[PDB]
Amino acid sequence: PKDYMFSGLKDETVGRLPGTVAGQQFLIQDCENCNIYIFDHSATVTIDDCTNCIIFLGPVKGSVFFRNCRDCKCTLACQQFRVRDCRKLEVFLCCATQPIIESSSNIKFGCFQWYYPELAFQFKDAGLSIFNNTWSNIHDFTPVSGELNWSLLPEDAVVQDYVPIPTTEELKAVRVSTEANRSIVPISRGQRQKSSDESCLVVLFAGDYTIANARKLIDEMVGKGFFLVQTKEVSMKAEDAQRVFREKAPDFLPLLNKGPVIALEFNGDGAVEVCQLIVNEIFNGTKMFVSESKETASGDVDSFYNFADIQMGI
Amino acid sequence: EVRILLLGLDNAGKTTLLKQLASEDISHITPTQGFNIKSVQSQGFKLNVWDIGGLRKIRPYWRSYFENTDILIYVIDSADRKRFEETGQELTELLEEEKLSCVPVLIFANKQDLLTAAPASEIAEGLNLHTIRDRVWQIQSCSALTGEGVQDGMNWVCKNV
Numbered sequence A: 001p002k003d004y005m006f007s008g009l010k011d012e013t014v015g016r017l018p019g020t021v022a023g024q025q026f027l028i029q030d031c032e033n034c035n036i037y038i039f040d041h042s043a044t045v046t047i048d049d050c051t052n053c054i055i056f057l058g059p060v061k062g063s064v065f066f067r068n069c070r071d072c073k074c075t076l077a078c079q080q081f082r083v084r085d086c087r088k089l090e091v092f093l094c095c096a097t098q099p100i101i102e103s104s105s106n107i108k109f110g111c112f113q114w115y116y117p118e119l120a121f122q123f124k125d126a127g128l129s130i131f132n133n134t135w136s137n138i139h140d141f142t143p144v145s146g147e148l149n150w151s152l153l154p155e156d157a158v159v160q161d162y163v164p165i166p167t168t169e170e171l172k173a174v175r176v177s178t179e180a181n182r183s184i185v186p187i188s189r190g191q192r193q194k195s196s197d198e199s200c201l202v203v204l205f206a207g208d209y210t211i212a213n214a215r216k217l218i219d220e221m222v223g224k225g226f227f228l229v230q231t232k233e234v235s236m237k238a239e240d241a242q243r244v245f246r247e248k249a250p251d252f253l254p255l256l257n258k259g260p261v262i263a264l265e266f267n268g269d270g271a272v273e274v275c276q277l278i279v280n281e282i283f284n285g286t287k288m289f290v291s292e293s294k295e296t297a298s299g300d301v302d303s304f305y306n307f308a309d310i311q312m313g314i
Numbered sequence B: 001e002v003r004i005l006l007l008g009l010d011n012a013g014k015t016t017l018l019k020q021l022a023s024e025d026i027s028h029i030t031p032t033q034g035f036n037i038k039s040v041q042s043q044g045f046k047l048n049v050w051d052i053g054g055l056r057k058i059r060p061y062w063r064s065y066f067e068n069t070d071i072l073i074y075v076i077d078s079a080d081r082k083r084f085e086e087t088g089q090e091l092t093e094l095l096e097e098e099k100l101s102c103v104p105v106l107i108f109a110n111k112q113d114l115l116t117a118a119p120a121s122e123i124a125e126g127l128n129l130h131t132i133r134d135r136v137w138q139i140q141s142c143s144a145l146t147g148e149g150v151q152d153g154m155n156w157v158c159k160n161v
């Protein structure tokens, strides 16, 4: 019963409201000058031979595949991201794994920045963690010496300019915001160039208020002029807590078994000190790991990605 | 000790299948650059599966693995009809390969958990598989996501080692 596809549409604005796909595959093909909004979770999405489209894809349990597409603007979250035979794509991405391009040019990437009330649950139904996002991490299977088939969107890029909010009847029943501070996926710089070579690691442990804590912390650090590089969500075993936390592991061992930890990488001159001050004021009674100094933070971050890379590796 | 080659188009689910056989986490599987190796016990056999990257650009490396392959497992995205012709063509070229002559091939009609998923029936004769007489072959509907139907494929693999 394939009312799970958009096929051969021109000059239209269509989409899907919550509960209307409920984790099924979705298919886009042969669409020109269309605005497509899929506000629900998907199994997987292929986009074939689309020209000058605006696409939003709610969380995708599997892969998102762009093939033979030109001048598309998208915001999407997915487990895998794949691109082939495409030109001039602009993507606001959340991806579990490494984004991949092949036989493509002018592909531009930015961090997923979107919100609506139903979205958080959709991520959950898609089995996608909002903290596992490697969006800047592109591998190009067909590099071309002397140039670059992909880049990053400027940080000052405003989401409205690439993926406008829907203004049709059907579609504004879904209450959307493209503000950084309301985004379900926290905004990460990934591999954006940095001015500072000071990082800070924070690890929060599973619990009902942890997610909220991560956000509040993120907001406090950004308020003081620091940057969020990366987030991670992974199981910490006792062995792993020893590698990362070292002779501070004892203090955290009790907590490791309630579920996955949440790691945050902060960046900026003074990051560790300022991070310590905030945690000390705003999370009394809540145990978190914060790097001791500028001198050890780098070590901290590496050890964490090391152990976590292997847990998520093959 | 059995040598398994895992091929099929990028995104068909080769690695997801490999990690299900080794019974491991499947939610952080990245597209494969290079290849992956895993030993798996089934039915009393030690299976060395070679999971090879399958995107168009790196298929020319497939050849360098044909050597001493006991079994070809070939994986298809059943829920991606658009690429039926492309996988159709890669499979036909494999079975022409001299170094793979006589090698039993199992086809996995993968992702049957999905809606657009074309049944093993349609794919089979869609690739006119019934005109393979060089070797023993089988089509197994499966889902590398849930692991359902996988064991049934592997049982046939053991039957034909």
Ligand SMILES: Nc1nc2c(ncn2[C@@H]2O[C@H](COP(=O)(O)OP(=O)(O)NP(=O)(O)O)[C@@H](O)[C@H]2O)c(=O)[nH]1
Binding pocket: A043, A044, A061, A062, A063, A079, A080, B008, B009, B010, B011, B012, B013, B014, B015, B016, B017, B026, B029, B030, B031, B032, B033, B052, B053, B054, B055, B110, B111, B112, B113, B114, B142, B143, B144, B145, B146
């Ligand atoms: N729903 C569903 N998704 C599946 C199934 N098998 C694989 N996938 C999904 O399909 C995508 C591709 O899987 P992957 O294992 O990377 O395929 P691959 O054949 O190794 N690709 P590559 O050749 O690039 O390495 C992932 O999003 C994976 O989660 C399945 O049976 N059902």
Ligand SMILES: [Mg+2]
Binding pocket: B014, B015, B016, B030, B031, B032, B051, B052, B053, B054
């Ligand atoms: Mg793979």
